[PDB]
Write a protein that holds these residues in place. Structure first.
Motif, PDB file in Angstrom:
ATOM      1  N   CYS A  76      40.400  67.290   0.847  1.00 30.90           N
ATOM      2  CA  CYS A  76      41.746  66.624   0.669  1.00 30.90           C
ATOM      3  C   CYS A  76      41.907  65.360   1.884  1.00 30.90           C
ATOM      4  O   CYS A  76      41.574  65.908   3.129  1.00 30.90           O
ATOM      5  CB  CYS A  76      42.820  67.713   0.888  1.00 30.90           C
ATOM      6  SG  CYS A  76      44.479  67.175   0.544  1.00 30.90           S
TER       7      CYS A  76
ATOM      8  N   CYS B 195      45.111  66.282   4.546  1.00 28.40           N
ATOM      9  CA  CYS B 195      45.010  67.036   6.072  1.00 28.40           C
ATOM     10  C   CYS B 195      43.430  67.134   6.283  1.00 28.40           C
ATOM     11  O   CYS B 195      43.208  67.637   7.556  1.00 28.40           O
ATOM     12  CB  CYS B 195      45.341  68.627   5.460  1.00 28.40           C
ATOM     13  SG  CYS B 195      44.565  69.049   4.273  1.00 28.40           S
TER      14      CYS B 195
ATOM     15  N   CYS C 225      44.440  71.666  -3.453  1.00 27.37           N
ATOM     16  CA  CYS C 225      44.382  71.684  -1.926  1.00 27.37           C
ATOM     17  C   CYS C 225      45.522  72.984  -1.904  1.00 27.37           C
ATOM     18  O   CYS C 225      46.869  72.675  -1.898  1.00 27.37           O
ATOM     19  CB  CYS C 225      44.684  70.673  -1.108  1.00 27.37           C
ATOM     20  SG  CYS C 225      44.948  71.059   0.591  1.00 27.37           S
TER      21      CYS C 225
ATOM     22  N   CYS D 137      48.039  71.980   1.412  1.00 22.56           N
ATOM     23  CA  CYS D 137      49.261  70.974   0.971  1.00 22.56           C
ATOM     24  C   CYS D 137      49.902  71.315  -0.536  1.00 22.56           C
ATOM     25  O   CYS D 137      51.195  70.561  -0.502  1.00 22.56           O
ATOM     26  CB  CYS D 137      48.656  69.522   0.638  1.00 22.56           C
ATOM     27  SG  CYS D 137      47.804  68.891   2.048  1.00 22.56           S
TER      28      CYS D 137
HETATM   29 ZN   LIG Z   1      45.421  68.855   1.866  1.00 22.07          ZN
END
Ligand SMILES: [Zn+2]
Lengths: 97, 76, 116, 58, 58, 209
Positions: free
Chosen positions: A45, A48, A57, A60
């Motif tokens: 991702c 992050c 993810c 998130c």
């Molecule tokens: Zn993420």
RNA sequence: GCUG
DNA sequence: TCAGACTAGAGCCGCTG
DNA sequence: CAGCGGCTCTAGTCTGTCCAGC
């Protein structure tokens, strides 16, 4: 695997690695020590910097920043041993251009 | 034009390697190969005739760059 | 046959004092020890001593190396103004990369520091 | 052990297109490689590129 | 020593073998030297630290 | 002794003249080249030749830039120098409006005095020298190359020729003895002329940091 | 433990 | 097994006020 | 007369010690 009994294969050690650097053989060192051992893909991702799964993810709760990175599996393993130690390798990925 | 005229050994190895992969993937061959079944042998023959469709971009450490054609560089 | 002159060999570790006694030609005395030469004469004299001493050791055992290799080694150990070893401590002052540092020695400590 | 240590430290150095030797971070180790720019593997003489007496006789 | 005259006129012609040098040989000499110098330079890209490491280690 | 003590006060003064000539201060050739017997004529035995006030030198003036720019070379009699000696030295410097001085200590300097030289003022800069360092001019030592302090208009060509920033050059410490000798400060560049094994020369550059 |  | 060059401590004496 | 402070010194401790095969 480790040897003849197990049809193991042969080791490119830390010293053979030093030989190939001195030839400037950048692609052969990539072929031997990534492609013909432990080539892998991880979902990363871009927001992050953590690893995800299946283009998702969990951190998130979103699907849009995830991307695939070609990585040696032993480095993926390292990036999950370290997180359990609470040393977080947060990656940042540019495009390949 | 400051960079060396002679092609470096590293440059020759990569140009032949990319050309061989391109030839092995069905690229056009400009050398009229005679009885050659190996892409690396075909690629080396192309370099001798100076007919390889690749441009070497040499990047200076600051970030400036100069592009040299494979034909223009002297091959030793 | 051409001459006879006496040089004085000192087995000891104070270069500055031997450079300053009356009747020693201080401009032409030297030392084995790169740390003494650095503390007394600066980084550029220490750089030459690494060249001279490696080349002296190689020639005695009948090996030969082109000067450009021992030159690069000495320039690597002195480009940050201090004589840095090829130890783990010198490499931690030369190299910024965590994964380079963590792939040689002290593999745990470098990874927790990068986290902190 | 010595070899491992030396290689880990010196692996990065590369001779650049502007005739300089730089680390990976972009600091300079040498402004020209070995003072001459010349390659140790190409020395026909004792650390020197040619030997003129031999070349003229040839 | 031998009383050679630079105009080429001297009768025992074998004397011109002693330290002979011709314009063609001078031209080929200077080209061979200049070429061997250019081809002896450390080529850009060379992993010059890894060669240094192994040359002191071995 | 007395033969040996005067020998130091001649060699130290000769080296101090050599340092001033290299740093660009104006010293006459008669000061630069002297003999111990000529030194004996100005002062002879340890009593007559007194280190504290007899040899003090404010003669040096930076002829190249400022006739006013001046340097005081002070040799303190006491072996370890306290702030009190430094304060007496500072007051002499404050009155004359001189901004640079050299202090030539005989054995050392006490820690609280050393701290003062960092912070007394940026506009009143004093450099400690031990006399045991001045008995041998390191710029004439066979292992030390020629160092040349570069001008800003030449540093701007060095960085243009290679397309560098300043922080990619090799470093030299200000604590380095050759750096102290020329009195250079952070952000100056020194050209260094290394001798080849052949007749030729190799030129390298360092940044004070 | 031995071979490399 | 053999250093080994870091990291705190215990002081120490003597100027530093 | 007293207090920082750096020196200086113990000594304490963690950190390495070739590549590979069976
Ligand atoms: Zn993420």
């Amino acid at each position: 695997t480790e040897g003849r009994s197990r049809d193991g294969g042969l080791r490119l050690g830390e010293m053979e690695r030093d030989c190939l650097i001195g030839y400037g053989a950048s692609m052969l060192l990539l072929e031997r020590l990534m492609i013909s051992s432990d080539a892998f893909e991880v979902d990363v991702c871009g927001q992050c910097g953590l690893l995800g799964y299946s283009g998702w993810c969990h951190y998130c709760k979103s699907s849009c920043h995830v991307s695939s990175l070609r990585i040696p599996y032993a480095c993926k393993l390292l990036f999950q041993e370290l997180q359990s130690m609470n040393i977080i390798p947060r990656l940042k990925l540019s495009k390949y251009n | 034009r400051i960079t060396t005229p002679y092609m470096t050994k590293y440059e020759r190895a990569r140009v032949l390697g990319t050309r061989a992969l391109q030839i092995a993937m069905c690229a056009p061959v400009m050398v009229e190969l005679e009885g050659e079944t190996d892409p690396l042998l075909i690629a080396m023959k192309e370099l001798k005739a100076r007919k390889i469709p690749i441009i070497i971009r040499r990047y200076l450490p600051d970030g400036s760059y100069e592009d040299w054609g494979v034909d223009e560089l002297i091959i030793t | 046959s051409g001459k006879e002159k006496y040089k004085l060999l000192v087995e000891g570790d104070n270069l500055r004092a031997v450079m300053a006694t009356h009747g020693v030609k201080g401009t032409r005395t030297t030392s084995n020890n790169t740390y003494e030469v650095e503390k007394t004469l600066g980084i550029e004299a220490a750089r030459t001593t690494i060249i001279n001493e490696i080349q002296y050791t190689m020639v005695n055992h009948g090996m030969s190396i082109d000067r450009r290799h021992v030159m690069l080694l000495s320039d690597l150990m002195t480009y940050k103004g201090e004589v840095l070893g090829i130890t783990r401590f010198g490499l931690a002052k030369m190299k910024e990369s965590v994964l380079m540092l963590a792939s040689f020695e002290k593999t745990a400590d470098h990874l927790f520091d990068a986290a902190y | 052990y010595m070899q491992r240590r030396l290689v880990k430290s010196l692996e990065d150095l590369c001779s650049q297109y502007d005739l300089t030797v730089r680390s990976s971070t972009g600091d300079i180790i040498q402004f020209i490689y070995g003072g001459d720019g010349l390659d140790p593997a190409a020395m026909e003489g004792k650390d020197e590129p040619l030997e003129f007496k031999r070349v003229l006789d040839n | 020593k031998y009383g050679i005259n630079d105009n080429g006129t001297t009768e025992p012609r074998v004397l011109y073998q002693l330290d002979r040098i011709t314009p063609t040989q001078v031209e080929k000499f200077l080209e061979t030297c200049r070429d061997k110098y250019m081809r002896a330079q450390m080529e850009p890209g060379s992993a010059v630290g890894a060669l240094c490491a192994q040359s002191i280690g071995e | 002794d007395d033969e040996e003590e005067t020998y130091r006060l001649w060699k130290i003064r000769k080296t101090i003249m050599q340092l001033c000539h290299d740093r660009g201060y104006l010293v006459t050739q008669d000061e630069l080249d002297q003999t111990l017997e000529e030194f004996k004529a100005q002062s002879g035995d340890k009593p007559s030749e007194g280190r504290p006030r007899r040899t003090d030198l404010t003669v040096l003036v930076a002829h190249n830039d400022d006739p006013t720019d001046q340097m005081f070379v002070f040799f303190p009699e006491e072996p370890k120098v306290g702030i009190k000696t430094i304060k007496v030295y500072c007051q002499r410097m404050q009155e004359e409006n001189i901004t640079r001085a050299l202090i030539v200590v005989q054995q050392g300097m006490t820690p609280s005095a050393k701290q003062s030289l960092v912070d007394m003022a940026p506009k009143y800069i004093l450099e400690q020298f031990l006399q045991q360092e001045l008995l041998i001019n390191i710029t004439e030592h066979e292992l030390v190359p020629e160092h040349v302090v570069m001008t800003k208009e030449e540093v701007t060509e060095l960085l243009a020729r290679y397309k560098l920033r300043e922080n990619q050059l090799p470093r030299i410490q200000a604590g380095d003895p050759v750096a102290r000798y020329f009195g250079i400060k952070r952000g100056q560049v020194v050209k260094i002329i290394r001798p080849s094994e052949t007749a030729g020369r190799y030129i390298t550059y360092r940044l004070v940091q």
